Amino acid sequence: SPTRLTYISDIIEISPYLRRLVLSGEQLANFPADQQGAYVKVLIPQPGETTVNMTLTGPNAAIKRSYTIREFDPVRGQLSLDFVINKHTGPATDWAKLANVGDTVAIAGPGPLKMNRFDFNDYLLFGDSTSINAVDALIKRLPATAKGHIIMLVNSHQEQALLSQHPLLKTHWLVLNDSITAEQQIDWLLDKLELFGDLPAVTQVFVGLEATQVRVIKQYLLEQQQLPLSSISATGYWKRNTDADTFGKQKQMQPL
Numbered sequence: 001s002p003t004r005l006t007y008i009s010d011i012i013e014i015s016p017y018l019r020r021l022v023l024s025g026e027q028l029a030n031f032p033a034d035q036q037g038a039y040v041k042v043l044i045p046q047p048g049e050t051t052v053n054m055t056l057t058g059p060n061a062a063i064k065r066s067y068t069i070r071e072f073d074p075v076r077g078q079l080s081l082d083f084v085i086n087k088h089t090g091p092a093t094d095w096a097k098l099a100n101v102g103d104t105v106a107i108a109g110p111g112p113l114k115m116n117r118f119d120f121n122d123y124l125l126f127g128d129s130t131s132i133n134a135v136d137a138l139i140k141r142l143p144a145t146a147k148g149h150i151i152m153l154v155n156s157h158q159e160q161a162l163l164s165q166h167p168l169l170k171t172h173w174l175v176l177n178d179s180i181t182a183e184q185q186i187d188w189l190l191d192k193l194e195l196f197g198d199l200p201a202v203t204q205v206f207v208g209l210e211a212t213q214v215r216v217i218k219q220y221l222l223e224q225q226q227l228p229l230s231s232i233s234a235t236g237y238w239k240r241n242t243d244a245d246t247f248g249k250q251k252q253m254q255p256l
């Protein structure tokens, strides 16, 4: 896929921890129209710089980070991405918090879609503010008859509106704050799992969460609920105390 030069045409705060950037430009005119919930790699300039180049490796290559397509309107040729802000420090979140309309942004991708099948009727969808737009994309493709649960960790009640309604899927939300420890988050996730009891054997599961959360949920599903591996689409979106490049190489060595 060709790297594309885009322009920020709008910025909107969605919550105190989530900033939507709307990208525009003639380079998006032929962007693929079927990739909601897929990710792109955003090139991030060095702090206090604005330019990036096409160098692949070494000290002059741009930092790259993965962000989910919230919306691509082909009539309008505009791409929306929702960046978590004010929860951590790193090149992309820092850059996103300070970005302005008219700034240019180079993007690559989209990357290969890793997502569940849309044709079943039993689902658990686990996500957080980093994966919420992948969860939304999946919900909007499921049959109206699909039963199950949506289980989300968000940084603000305001983020809940990002998920499509669905007639039957039941939502469960935990709004995070600094008093809720990593262990308590895992306890909450496992508490929800146990509350679902014996899962239908045909249940399909999406997980897009922090790396250890993914490990715990996946192991529970495989060993306690005995779901087939093929029924789980699990991705570690981020990992505590680990930058994206380090994390990427960890996942290459040992996939989740």
Ligand SMILES: Cc1cc2nc3c(=O)[nH]c(=O)nc-3n(C[C@H](O)[C@H](O)[C@H](O)COP(=O)(O)OP(=O)(O)OC[C@H]3O[C@@H](n4cnc5c(N)ncnc54)[C@H](O)[C@@H]3O)c2cc1C
Residues within 6 Å of the ligand: 039, 065, 066, 067, 068, 069, 081, 082, 083, 084, 085, 087, 088, 089, 090, 091, 092, 093, 094, 129, 130, 131, 133, 235, 236, 237, 238, 239, 240, 241, 242, 243, 244, 245
């Ligand atoms: C397919 C895919 C799609 C993604 N889509 C989105 C998206 O749409 N929106 C989004 O915000 N993120 C998304 N992410 C996650 C995003 O790529 C990471 O959060 C990334 O680490 C952010 O880059 P950074 O440069 O800000 O921080 P990094 O330099 O990668 O990390 C620096 C520090 O920040 C920690 N950290 C990173 N992210 C978080 C976080 N959200 N919360 C708390 N601590 C964090 C790290 O553990 C590390 O210690 C996606 C990831 C994947 C794999």
Ligand SMILES: [Mg+2]
Residues within 6 Å of the ligand: 005, 006, 007, 024, 025, 026, 027, 028
């Ligand atoms: Mg353009």
Ligand SMILES: [Mg+2]
Residues within 6 Å of the ligand: 083, 084, 093, 130
């Ligand atoms: Mg993030």
Ligand SMILES: [Mg+2]
Residues within 6 Å of the ligand: 084, 085, 086, 087, 088, 089, 093
């Ligand atoms: Mg942040």
Ligand SMILES: [Mg+2]
Residues within 6 Å of the ligand: 036, 037, 136, 137, 138, 140, 141
């Ligand atoms: Mg969709």
Ligand code: NA
Residues within 6 Å of the ligand: 013, 014, 015, 158
């Ligand atoms: Na909002």
Ligand code: NA
Residues within 6 Å of the ligand: 012, 013, 014, 015
């Ligand atoms: Na808003």
Ligand code: NA
Residues within 6 Å of the ligand: 015, 017, 018, 083, 084, 085, 129, 154, 155, 156, 159
């Ligand atoms: Na957020």
Ligand code: NA
Residues within 6 Å of the ligand: 024, 025, 026, 027
């Ligand atoms: Na243009």
Ligand code: NA
Residues within 6 Å of the ligand: 037, 038, 039, 040, 110, 111, 112, 113, 114
């Ligand atoms: Na993708």
Ligand code: NA
Residues within 6 Å of the ligand: 044, 045, 046, 049, 050, 051, 052
């Ligand atoms: Na730069």
Ligand code: NA
Residues within 6 Å of the ligand: 051, 052, 053, 054, 055, 060, 061, 062
């Ligand atoms: Na560069």
Ligand code: NA
Residues within 6 Å of the ligand: 054, 055, 056
């Ligand atoms: Na190149």
Ligand code: NA
Residues within 6 Å of the ligand: 055, 056, 060
């Ligand atoms: Na070079």
Ligand code: NA
Residues within 6 Å of the ligand: 037, 038, 039, 067, 068, 069, 131, 133, 134
């Ligand atoms: Na995604």
Ligand code: NA
Residues within 6 Å of the ligand: 067, 068, 069, 070, 080, 081, 082, 083, 133
């Ligand atoms: Na997004």
